Design a protein around this nucleic acid. Structure first.
Ligand SMILES: [Zn+2]
Ligand SMILES: [Zn+2]
Lengths: 94, 99, 82, 108, 76, 148, 87, 99, 83, 109, 93
DNA sequence: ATCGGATGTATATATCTGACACGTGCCTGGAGACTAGGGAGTAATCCCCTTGGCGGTTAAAACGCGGGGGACAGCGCGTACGTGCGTTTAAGCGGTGCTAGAGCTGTCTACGACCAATTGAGCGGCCTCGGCACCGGGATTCTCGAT
DNA sequence: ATCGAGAATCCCGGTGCCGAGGCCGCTCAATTGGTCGTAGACAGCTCTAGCACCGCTTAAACGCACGTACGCGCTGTCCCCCGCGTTTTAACCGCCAAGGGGATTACTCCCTAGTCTCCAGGCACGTGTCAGATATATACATCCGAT
């Protein structure tokens, strides 16, 4: 058998089931969603790495990702994304 | 006596049909042959995956659709309905593709 | 050897593309300019894809290479990988 | 949160956290990666995916279909404002274009 | 003998075993006196992980020894 | 504050209507701390088993879920030896609409039948799945050891 | 709607109090502004009763400043003024 | 009897003179005050290095020069020497700045 | 220390001079109100990015480095001011 | 080579090679850095700088000045066909613009 | 104080090598520093991505060569490739 | 078709000043020698799939023709902008006072890198049934020549 | 202003098909537990320059009057895409056959990260001086009403 190939299929399907319980999704939409997730991940991580290199630091804390999300996304989406990330961080640590 | 539509009243119907559809608009074999010749110009004896040709066709279609939208807007700005090549050169010059 | 395949893009095909664009009346000189600009775009993208294939020590192009070649130029493409 | 349970469940997310952490470390973005960054990044990704999926599902239901196809994604992305600005450059395969006819071209 | 085992909960348990007693008998005594499932225990003597192959005589446990218990368990 | 008033309405609600086999009361002076009892349902392997559990309320309620802990020891695939409870409603779908009566009745319902899909303890869950009689007898000896 | 509102229905489903600056969700559920303004950051960003995401509607209405309903606020304050004044 | 130039020659002379020079064309203090007003909205009690203000002024001048070049091209395309706000709007829309 | 009605500081002769550099021979009278709006929007974007950059670094004074970085991010790369 | 002189002079260059190697290693671009890459990068950088400098010097000499100011750099970059495409998005500070006027706007005969 | 390194001496050496009787002002010097940094960052980023694409963990010379071929236009790319190949060949022996 | 103001721009010469080119102390980063282990080059082998080909068949492309609508040239107008000049305004430049805050340094504590055992989340291969596509029929709706 | 006939489009029902969601088996990567060198958080000190103020210029800005050229609307003419019909062409689908090269595993070797030690190359600092900006005074290209 061929080697494993990682993908974000399961998680996208789970989120879709959480939003619209009775709605399915096709394979081409899965490819599009996987590409979109990879694109956003690379953009955010690259911006965070660049910004951490600007201030002469070696670690990428949550603050760098927060600022990268504040920069890349439009303001209205940035506010909600920052709120969601702050939730996730404050709920994970306790 | 035979029924004939007014000049230009079926172009609107064609627009309304095509902007609703999502299929490809260029025949597969001619575009594939064009891609093959352009490729073999750079290097001899290449082999193309089908998905690669499909991606190339999708990119070309999207680019041409955008260019035609901007050209139509230029033509309407010039107080015209037709589109002429100078509109295409103006759109390319402003977009910075040629400069 | 293959040649004169640029005529494969027929006038009705460019007419349909322009109709999707949103034009109502097309002059008779659009077709040659459209062929020229399409050829230029294909030359650029295919050259980038062929260079990407060359770097990988392979003698066949892959849709993945074309996707990255499009991404480099600033025209990202979804639905084919990446 | 309690220990000895999966991190994705500890943080309440759906997207994986360990996978995001591994990608951050081994993707050559920095010498060291914090422990809290993957949670934040996965949360942002999940929020964006949920938003776009909800819009696509609403469009598909409006189109009287039960499965989301790329045309629904194109409609959801372009109809919205912030999502359109974020995804202005990307091209959706087999997505089509929005119906737009200039008022001048319409018959009088 | 008398062996004191300190767990992560601070529970004091004293076991009476023999140097010639095998690990199976010790685990049976643990099951009898505690009821905790056997698969959840891998014990540490002087920083060395215990293996059921060797007996207590090989280790030569000194009198009044403190025993530490750690092992991964899914569910917390 | 608002959490205190909400607790007041909820204590009045539980006082006016007592759930079957369920009683809740504040053991400490602080209103956040609570104690409750669970009685083994008739249609369950547990018979004549009564257990005591403690409830801790966060600073903000019901925005954050309460924490439930089992002071007594129960042998169950979904309950650890320490007494922690792994429940979906407790963390995944906690909502301000849900109340303490509902979460306790849900705990009782899960106590009726283990869920192998999300095993808190893997070995106990699998040995439960393999054979009914083994789990039945181990649960019986454990409940006569602890519950009675 | 419901020009003759009962006092019992005016109770907020969360904090059990008369509605203050009500906000109507697309699921036709009404609750006081503090409850929603809190649950949007410290709850699952979904309707507590319906359990479905409302992120898009909230995102669109936040920029337009159309969260509040003037008609329901006015009818509540005129019908039950003494509960509003004590707040 | 007084000598005055035909309308248009002075404009050409100014164009020729200004395309040769390289200094800045917006007064320093008004631009500094405008930058401070814009900045104080996002965060209060900020302080600016002089080099930052100069960089902002340079970038703004270059961007406006490019926009005016494109606007003039649009105006000349429609057989008009004069430029109009519709030309600016068309240039910005085709460049994708407004979308 | 409030600031008001200051966008008008970009005078009509300044915009005329900028257009003259651009290559404009005849300017209408409605240009001078559109140009101020365009400049305000562009400056708003650049200043927002620069203020975010100086907010991350826990500093109370912006620097030419932050402005250069914001311009590079927005696509308008700038030379001769550091980097 | 003789493996005796400094690394920069060993490759017959002027740009440093040790600095390029350090920047490649500590600039978190990859886990490992090859031995020959920094020499190639330094050569490319030197050659590009050489072209820009010679074009600026020519543009300054045609102006009858002995110093290269940013205006000369702008003229050299904009006039050359390939360098303009390479540096299309770059904004040179105090560089000005190339002088041109559309043929329509010239005075009528 | 602190030390702020730059590409100053090397650029001045190249300028003297090309035009023996000219000079460069400070502003043009900073412009040259910024340009060199920009080109270096572009090439390094492209080479890093190329190395990551093929499941490789090193940056050999051919990665830099391919990045140079991709980024620069035709004649510039050919001349840069020739110059780099000559430099590395003279370096390796 | 130029003619002579009238203007602005180009050109020749003294001068003096502040930035540019260069000398110098030195210290931090670059160079030289040895080790080891993991990454990368090389060889052998599988089988996926991409190229090549023949036959049907038929939707799409090519050619021709009538003509209505649109692009383009010419004319007239009145109004908005270019040009010039007197007047009010605030940028510009020098000099000074100061302190908020950038920037460097010494400690050390808590966050993150590293490594082995382990098993459960997640991927590959199968399978079936329902949602979607195709076709036949009719109801609904723009459209245009003639009133 | 409209009627009505011809043509395109939208609904509804029936039938068939194939891929999407669920399931089972398995291999590998995330968890956990503990250990240890170090990253940066914090407190403290130094001294740079960003802010605010003052006063004296005179350069750019402002408002007004006048004239003109050009943006806009209107009208007329010709010609060229459009819509339709008829005919020729090759795209498309199905089918078969082959072997080239992508992809995988196993093996070996050597390139480079790491460590330590030693030393000179570039950096901050200071100094001399001449290139170019400034002022002043001629000489020539260019524009404008009118012969
Ligand atoms: Zn409430
Ligand atoms: Zn709801």
């Amino acid at each position: 058998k061929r080697s494993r190939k990682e993908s974000y299929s399961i998680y996208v399907y789970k989120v879709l089931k959480q939003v619209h319980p009775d709605t399915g999704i096709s394979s081409k939409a899965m490819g599009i969603m996987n590409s979109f997730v990879n694109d956003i991940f690379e953009r955010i991580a690259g911006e965070a790495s660049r910004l951490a290199h600007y201030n002469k630091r070696s670690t990428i804390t949550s603050r760098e990702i927060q600022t990268a999300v504040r920069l890349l996304l439009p303001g209205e989406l940035a506010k909600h994304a920052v709120s969601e990330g702050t939730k996730a961080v404050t709920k994970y640590t306790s | 006596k035979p029924h004939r539509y007014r000049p230009g009243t079926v172009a609107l119907r064609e627009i309304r049909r095509y902007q609703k559809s999502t299929e490809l608009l260029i025949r597969k074999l001619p575009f594939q042959r064009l891609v093959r010749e352009i490729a073999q110009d750079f290097k001899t004896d290449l082999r193309f995956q089908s998905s690669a040709v499909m991606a190339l066709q999708e990119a070309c279609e999207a680019y041409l659709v955008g260019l035609f939208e901007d050209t139509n807007l230029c033509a309407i700005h010039a107080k015209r309905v037709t589109i002429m090549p100078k509109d295409i050169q103006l759109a390319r010059r402003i977009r910075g593709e040629r400069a | 050897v293959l040649r004169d395949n640029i005529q494969g893009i027929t006038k009705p095909a460019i007419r349909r593309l322009a109709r999707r664009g949103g034009v109502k009346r097309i002059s008779g000189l659009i077709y040659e300019e459209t062929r020229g600009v399409l050829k230029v775009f294909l030359e650029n993208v295919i050259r980038d894809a062929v260079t990407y294939t060359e770097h990988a020590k392979r003698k066949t192009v892959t849709a993945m290479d074309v996707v990255y070649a499009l991404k480099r130029q600033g025209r990202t493409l979804y639905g084919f990988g990446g | 949160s309690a220990k000895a349970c999966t991190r994705s469940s500890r943080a309440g997310l759906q997207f994986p956290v360990g996978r995001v952490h591994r990608l951050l470390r081994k993707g050559n973005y920095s010498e060291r990666v914090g422990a809290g960054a993957p949670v934040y990044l996965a949360a942002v990704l999940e929020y964006l995916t949920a938003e776009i999926l909800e819009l696509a599902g609403n469009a598909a239901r409006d189109n009287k279909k039960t499965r989301i196809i790329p045309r629904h994604l194109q409609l959801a992305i372009r109809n919205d404002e912030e999502l359109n600005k974020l995804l202005g450059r990307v091209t959706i395969a087999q997505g089509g274009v929005l119906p737009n006819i200039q008022a001048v071209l319409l018959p009088k | 003998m008398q062996i004191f085992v300190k767990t992560l909960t601070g529970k004091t348990i004293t076991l009476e075993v023999e140097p010639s007693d095998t690990i199976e008998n010790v685990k049976a005594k643990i099951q009898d006196k505690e009821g905790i499932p056997p698969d959840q225990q891998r014990l540490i003597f002087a920083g060395k992980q215990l293996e059921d192959g060797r007996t207590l005589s090989d280790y030569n446990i000194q009198k009044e020894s403190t025993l530490h218990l750690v092992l991964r368990l899914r569910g917390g | 504050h608002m959490a205190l008033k909400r607790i007041n309405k909820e204590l009045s609600d539980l006082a006016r209507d007592p759930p079957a086999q369920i009683s809740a009361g504040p053991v400490g002076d602080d209103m956040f701390h609570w104690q409750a009892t669970i009685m083994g349902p008739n249609d369950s392997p547990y018979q004549g088993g009564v257990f005591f559990l403690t409830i801790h309320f966060p600073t903000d309620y019901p925005f954050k879920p309460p924490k439930v802990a089992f002071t007594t020891r129960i042998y169950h695939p979904n309950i650890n030896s320490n007494g922690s409870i792994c429940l979906d409603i407790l963390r995944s779908q906690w909502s301000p609409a849900l109340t303490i009566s509902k979460v306790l009745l849900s705990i009782a319902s899960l106590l009726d039948d283990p869920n192998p899909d999300d095993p808190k303890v893997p070995e106990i869950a699998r040995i439960y799945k393999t054979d009914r009689d083994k789990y039945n007898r181990i649960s019986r000896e454990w409940t006569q050891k602890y519950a009675m | 709607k419901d020009a003759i509102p009962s006092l019992s229905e005016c109770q907020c489903g969360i904090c059990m109090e008369i509605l203050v600056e009500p906000v109507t969700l697309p699921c036709n559920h009404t609750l006081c502004k503090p409850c929603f303004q809190s649950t949007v950051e410290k709850a699952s960003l979904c309707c507590p009763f319906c359990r479905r995401r409302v992120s898009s509607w909230t995102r669109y209405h936040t920029r337009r400043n159309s969260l509040v309903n003037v008609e329901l606020w006015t009818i509540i304050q005129k019908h039950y003024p003494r509960e509003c004044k004590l707040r």
